[PDB]
Amino acid sequence: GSSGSSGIKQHCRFCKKKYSDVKNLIKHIRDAHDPQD
């Protein structure tokens, strides 16, 4: 099943969104904010 509590919580530091995986957060950061520039 696609639903459940068995996962992590991570957050954005530039638009304050929330994500269920750190790799999905990093994919959001490198697309929307890219702080390495």
Residues found near Zn ion in the complex (CB under 5 A): 12, 14-15
Contact 26, 35 (CB under 8 A): no
CB 8, min distance to Zn ion, A: 17
Per the annotation, does 8 bind a ligand? no
CB 1, min distance to Zn ion, A: 28
Per the annotation, does 33 bind a ligand? yes
Per the annotation, does 15 bind a ligand? yes
To the nearest 10°, report the CA torsion of 36, 26, 16, 21. -160
Contact 15, 21 (CB under 8 A): no
- Binding-site residues, in ranges, read 12, 15, 28, 33
